[PDB]
């Protein structure tokens, strides 16, 4: 159960973005069913009236929260993959739209998950903006909690892999269009029951044999991670 607050940008606070700049959902309940257009931007989809500017090369940090700003982010019962993927604005999410930017599950070295860092992060993960055509975008931030995805949503409606799902609006100002955005997947539609990493056992299976659904981070995407770049408590 977790909400984005807002974005940073170089490591500077945007600011409460709630239904502001991020397409908030009224509260912070999962997302389960593959085949909902709830899958695309959550469960309150329109336009917001502001989008954070940016320029290609900027770090772009998602900031995620339980109940308060900066405060357990996500049960950490909740283990799983996080990924960020973009789409142009004119499309509403709508159509095969999304690209990949970034992609973590399983960190063997550290023995973590991506939302075990997320915590440790303060909630807090990046992409590198990239070299896309300038105008508006929606970058959609995806957590999938694993702790009941043995079962699927499409048998078990009380049970499946939990979808945290954030759409920010992005205005890349600044970039030379050098790496012009690739064909999208949709959402909904790109993920199915038989995807690799919507039915797992985190139980029994060995986190190193997990595989995160596709698609593949595209070979565009210029770097991100999950790590805490600012410090909320000094506002
Ligand atoms: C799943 O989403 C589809 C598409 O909106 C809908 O028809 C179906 O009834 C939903 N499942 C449940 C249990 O609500
Ligand atoms: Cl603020
Ligand atoms: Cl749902
Ligand atoms: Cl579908
Ligand atoms: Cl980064
Ligand atoms: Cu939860």
């Given at each position: 159960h977790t909400l984005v607050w807002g974005v940073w940008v170089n490591g500077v606070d945007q600011g409460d973005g709630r239904n502001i700049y991020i397409r908030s959902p009224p509260n912070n309940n999962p997302v389960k069913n593959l085949t909902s257009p709830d899958m695309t931007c959550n469960v309150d989809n329109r336009v917001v009236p502001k989008s954070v500017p940016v320029n290609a090369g900027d770090t772009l940090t998602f900031e995620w929260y339980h109940n308060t700003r900066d405060d357990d982010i996500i049960a950490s019962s909740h283990h799983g993959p996080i990924a960020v993927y973009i789409a142009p604005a004119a499309s509403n999410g709508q159509g095969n739209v999304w690209v990949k930017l970034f992609e973590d599950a399983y960190n063997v070295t550290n023995s973590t998950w991506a939302v075990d860092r997320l915590i440790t992060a303060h909630g807090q993960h990046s992409v590198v903006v990239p070299h896309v055509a300038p105008g508006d975008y929606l970058f959609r931030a995806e957590i999938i909690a694993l702790?009941?995805?043995?079962?699927?949503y499409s048998q078990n409606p009380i049970r499946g892999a939990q979808f945290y799902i954030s759409c920010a609006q992005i205005t890349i100002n600044?970039?030379?269009?050098?790496?012009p955005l690739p064909a999208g997947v949709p959402f909904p539609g790109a993920y199915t029951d038989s995807t690799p990493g919507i039915q797992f056992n985190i139980y029994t299976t060995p986190a190193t044999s997990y595989v995160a659904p596709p698609p593949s981070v595209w070979s565009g995407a210029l770097g991100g991670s999950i790590a805490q770049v600012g410090d909320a408590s000094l506002e």
């Open positions: 702790h009941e995805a043995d079962s699927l600044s970039s030379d269009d050098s790496t």
